[PDB]
Ligand SMILES: Cc1cc2nc3c(=O)[nH]c(=O)nc-3n(C[C@H](O)[C@H](O)[C@H](O)COP(=O)(O)OP(=O)(O)OC[C@H]3O[C@@H](n4cnc5c(N)ncnc54)[C@H](O)[C@@H]3O)c2cc1C
């Protein structure tokens with residue numbers, strides 16, 4: 441069960457949500473949190489959004505009030521832990537004893553080889569320090585080159601374009617958001633950005649850089665005042681790999697957050713868990729998972745009677761005039777399109793069914809519909825289809841079932 445003292449490695453959203461719940465759930469023993477970043481815990485979503493505008497870090501901190509009597513060692517790096525001795529080695533020479541150790545060390549932005557040394561600025565966007573460096577070089581008319589058509593990339597493009605900056609983007613795949621988005625949505629998102637002035641380069645990839653210019657695998661090149669790489673992340677599982685835990689670019693855990701090493705748990709971006717919708721193990725790297733999974737695992741540690749994590753995946757993405765929300769899977773048997781798909785009236789909903797069962801949904805500028813659809817997906821609803829394609833009230837249909 442829950443052996444004290446509790447030691448959490450990492451101080452991001454997963455860590456803060458987990459420790460807050462431990463307390464709320466009634467745990468009153470010792471709790472210590474080790475954060476390598478010398479920063480008061482903050483949320484990352486704003487780093488590519490509003491923060492890029494106001495640059496106010498006090499407007500994006502996380503609320504640790506729900507987590508009383510917790511000692512946060514910020515600026516300190518957990519160098520390793522001994523699972524037999526039940527201790528953690530810190531970078532300041534200290535050692536922390538633990539009864540129950542949690543690894544919520546998240547992940548880190550994948551680096552871009554070829555751009556090794558490329559004279560001009562080259563950043564990744566993961567931290568507040570990153571956010572700050574990039575924000576600086578976002579001077580108007582300047583030229584920004586984004587490598588990666590993922591969510592960080594398109595969110596920065598919108599913010600870069602929204603500030604008089606010029607934007608160019610390179611993607612290796614034939615479409616954007618290849619990772620977790622319906623193709624229907626990607627074609628549109630691509631259409632939207634191109635329309636906002638973004639130079640999209642598909643099936644292209646950066647091969648190098650020679651004096652403030654970038655080389656592409658298409659024999660061509662592109663000039664840029666600053667390059668921001670957004671090509672995915674890698675789990676910060678180095679410590680678990682060394683302590684012999686089971687992992688492969690992410691730590692494997694069950695619905696209780698258990699790793700293959702006794703008394704050691706893991707949550708957040710740093711883990712590969714089961715997707716209840718695809719029945720496959722994968723790394724769910726979303727804000728909702730970071731928070732929801734932390735609480736779930738904390739809730740069960742304090743009370744074994746409580747169920748394991750079961751929340752279904754979903755996430756949002758703010759890209760300029762596009763308020764996107766994607767839940768469940770990106771495809772299935774068929775997809776129903778509620779509303780019209782136009783660059784002028786950007787407002788619509790996509791529903792992904794598998795053999796009649798809703799397995800995913802996408803809401804563009806339509807938050808009213810998201811909540812009910814998540815409810816219907818939550819129960820694998822098998823609603824009409826015709827009533828599902830025409831102006832019916834989902835809140836209601838959801839209410840019916
Ligand atoms: C710019 C940006 C925008 C985003 N926007 C969205 C969005 O719109 N919607 C959405 O759903 N999600 C979004 N996300 C994703 C969301 O931020 C992540 O899902 C969430 O932060 C994952 O939390 P985490 O607790 O697992 O780990 P993280 O936040 O990575 O934190 C782990 C922490 O542990 C530290 N650490 C690692 N190793 C050690 C060690 N050995 N010792 C001590 N400390 C260590 C790390 O440095 C880090 O500070 C965004 C992310 C970024 C970066």
Ligand SMILES: NC(=O)c1ccc[n+]([C@@H]2O[C@H](COP(=O)([O-])OP(=O)(O)OC[C@H]3O[C@@H](n4cnc5c(N)ncnc54)[C@H](O)[C@@H]3O)[C@@H](O)[C@H]2O)c1
Nearest residue numbers: 588589590591592610611612618670671672725755756757
């Ligand atoms: N709105 C959101 O949900 C959101 C926003 C920002 C960041 N995040 C989180 O940030 C982390 C990483 O985000 P991300 O956007 O960098 O990654 P990602 O995996 O979402 O997207 C990376 C994109 O880069 C492309 N790519 C890969 N290698 C490339 C190369 N060499 N050149 C050009 N393109 C290449 C991929 O095909 C993919 O479309 C994840 O944990 C993610 O969930 C989420």
